[PDB]
UniProtKB/Swiss-Prot annotation, chain B:
It comes from the Eukaryota. Component of the NuA4 histone acetyltransferase complex which is involved in transcriptional activation of selected genes principally by acetylation of nucleosomal histone H4 and H2A. The NuA4 complex is also involved in DNA repair. Component of the NuA4 histone acetyltransferase complex composed of at least ACT1, ARP4, YAF9, VID21, SWC4, EAF3, EAF5, EAF6, EAF7, EPL1, ESA1, TRA1 and YNG2. Present with 1890 molecules/cell in log phase SD medium. The gene is EAF3. This is Chromatin modification-related protein EAF3. Belongs to the MRG family. Signal peptide: none annotated. It is found in: Nucleus.
Curated annotation (Swiss-Prot), chains D, F:
GO terms for molecular function: DNA binding; protein heterodimerization activity; structural constituent of chromatin. There is a cross-link at residue 70 (Glycyl lysine isopeptide (Lys-Gly) (interchain with G-Cter in ubiquitin)). Core component of nucleosome. Nucleosomes wrap and compact DNA into chromatin, limiting DNA accessibility to the cellular machineries which require DNA as a template. Histones thereby play a central role in transcription regulation, DNA repair, DNA replication and chromosomal stability. DNA accessibility is regulated via a complex set of post-translational modifications of histones, also called histone code, and nucleosome remodeling. This is Histone H4. The chain holds residues 23 to 101 of 103 of the full protein.
Length: 52, 49, 98, 79, 98, 79, 52
DNA sequence: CCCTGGAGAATCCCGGTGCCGAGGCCGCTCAATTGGTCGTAGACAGCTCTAGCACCGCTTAAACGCACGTACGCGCTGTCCCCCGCGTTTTAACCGCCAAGGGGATTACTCCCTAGTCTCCAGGCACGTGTCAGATATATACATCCTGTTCTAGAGCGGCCGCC
DNA sequence: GGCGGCCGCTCTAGAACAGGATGTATATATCTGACACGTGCCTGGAGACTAGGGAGTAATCCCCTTGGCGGTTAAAACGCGGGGGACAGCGCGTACGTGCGTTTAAGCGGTGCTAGAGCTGTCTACGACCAATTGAGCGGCCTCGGCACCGGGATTCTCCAGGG
């Protein structure tokens, strides 16, 4: 989460950072696959054929 | 024994017609010839026609 | 003179990028809160919900619908499409077990 | 309270699909998504109703909502 | 001339036959030795009971049958009748496996 | 013990899909089906390995497989 | 299960009948949705477009 | 029809405000910590004996492989109607402010019923066994599916008739 | 006398229908193997009893969600333009359905050995519980600074128009 907070140049850990930390790690993603994180959103990814 | 032996036009008869179901066999004893398997099953049935 | 006239799809992709990195609740508070009360009133009348209780219901429902929409969207490319369908949701719920 | 299923507006369903990375949204998606949300809400709130009724309480707390979501494999963090 | 069943008629007949009969589709020993080589990576000195392999085999097939049902439904969803590996990958992703 | 992933033969995978109602089977399905079977087996059997190791036993029982499948929401009846 | 056994002209309950009984009934199907039944198979249903 | 230059608009980097939620401090009090003491679950040692591991005949249904063709995945085209981008005007969403009164939370008294034993006995389990429904087996019989032949409708052609 | 129009004739093909084929639906014959009934225990629940402790109930309280107001500006909704995509349709081909030859190992039955899981003692440290205690977690209060907000500016990516 601190690495994600440093990615978007933020000092304070916000729930978006915790959600980004959980989903990015494949070990944390499978461990928390059935886990909903409030105020976290999802991973900002776009499908290959959906790109212009 | 063999691979072609029938009284009528042979269809690769074992001693059984290969490529066909088991309920098509006849094991009667008649005059059986080969003739190069009726000249390659009647030259591929006149070329499919 | 000529209007900008953005083609369909490009602004939708921009809305995807602006909302995937966002954090705020997309569904409005009172319309979702009023929907909770009418659903609960069929089960039990004279029932109240806390403000954080409705807030907890709102984020869970959005994330469940977002995760459903990702399965809905991924089925579209699987079906050689870019537009989601009502049958796309029905396939997603059936595979998920719902 | 009637016709509150339309509170989840068409842009609201559109915005939810934008968070999921949906390129295009059909016109029949909104009615189906409202029905899916109604079914999902009818299960979580009913489970929270039994949780609230078991505690001899008349107001549903956020903690009971967490237990209602946790028992179906959809646990929520942060309440 | 041979009867020459059209493609799909015998496949449907196997569908009718295997959906009412509870015989075990995968053979015992080829599935049994697969368990031993998989468990060899975790424990070299390990044994398996006859019912232990039996319990693993029915669970694996029912998971595979349920996966094939979701894979098949994705094919008709994608205007197809032939199951595809990308249909399997969509099934695991929607179910949350992979 | 090597090349035992081929023990799940092509008609055996074919019989599985016929039980699932599949009409037509692609030629690349069998390799993919073997992969998802290997992944599923590598989770349940490994879970049963930890169950057997904790039980101070060197032989995996069907009872340990029951809890191994149950903890992943795949409980099996009849053991 | 007894009704399914009578439909199959059987007077003994077999695991196929139990699987048919569970999956046919809607509340039993959802309750035991995450439940595997051995020696039971699945329901003998075919999709509409798969028919000749 | 495709490549490249210029400009419209939503997005990104940056300076200044500040504020309100986060970081730090004070008690202090209630839950974490120290020592002792037993009932007791558990690690350890020996027996065993019932089920799994390894190899062997065999035979036979299951499985690899090759020949063939037709349902079907996939490539390509149009369209049109279904969905998006944007201008306008309502609209109810969010926020500022106010009481309310059911209701969550806390404290206390007390009273039922559940913790914990004694004894026993009648339902529940291991063992033994006659038995009655299921499976194997096979001629018989369904049973639908595939295919061949015939029936009837449709379009094309040619002969005949009337008109200029 | 030439030619357009009309009707009859033969060709062709779609489709309903009947017959053959092969894998299953049943009618016994008989095996057979677990099913359930009977028996003999016997080991865990039940009647009865003792004691105590956690919740039902009553009271309080303060607190927090509902109703209820408007302001306002963000946004839903309506509609117009239009534009790119879902799908009907068509064509290619390949690659997977169907079928048996051949092979090869699945599985049934058999035999032998031992890896080791219950089973029974044994003895032993270990954790719940009881006095006794004590020290930083948390409610609350003081302080403070990171990023929301508000603009300002800008690179910077993107679309429309012009040229080859």
């Amino acid at each position: 989460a601190g690495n994600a907070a440093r990615d978007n140049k933020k000092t304070r850990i916000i729930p978006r950072h915790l959600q980004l930390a959980v989903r990015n790690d494949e070990e944390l993603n499978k461990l928390l696959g059935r886990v909903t994180i409030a105020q976290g959103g999802v991973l900002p990814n776009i499908q290959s054929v959906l790109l212009p | 024994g063999g691979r072609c032996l029938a009284f009528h036009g042979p269809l690769m008869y074992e001693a059984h017609y290969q490529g066909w179901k088991s309920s098509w066999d006849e094991w009667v004893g008649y005059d059986r010839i080969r003739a190069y398997n009726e000249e390659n099953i009647a030259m591929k049935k006149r070329l499919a026609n | 003179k000529k209007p900008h006239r953005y083609r369909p799809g490009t602004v939708a992709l921009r809305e995807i990028r602006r909302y995937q990195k966002s954090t705020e609740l997309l569904i409005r508070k009172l319309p979702f809160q009023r929907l909770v009360r009418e659903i609960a009133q069929d089960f039990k009348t004279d029932l109240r919900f806390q403000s954080s209780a409705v807030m907890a219901l709102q984020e869970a429902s959005e994330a469940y619908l977002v995760a459903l929409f990702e399965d809905t969207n991924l089925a579209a490319i699987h079906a050689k499409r870019v537009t989601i369908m009502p049958k796309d949701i029905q396939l997603a719920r059936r595979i998920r077990g719902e | 309270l009637r016709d509150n299923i339309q509170g989840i507006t068409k842009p609201a369903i559109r915005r939810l699909a934008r968070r999921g990375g949906v390129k295009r949204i059909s016109g029949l998606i909104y009615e189906e998504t409202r029905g899916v949300l109604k079914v999902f809400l009818e299960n979580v709130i009913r489970d929270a109703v039994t949780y609230t009724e078991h505690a001899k309480r008349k107001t549903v707390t956020a903690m009971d909502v967490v237990y209602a979501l946790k028992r179906q494999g959809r646990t929520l963090y942060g309440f």
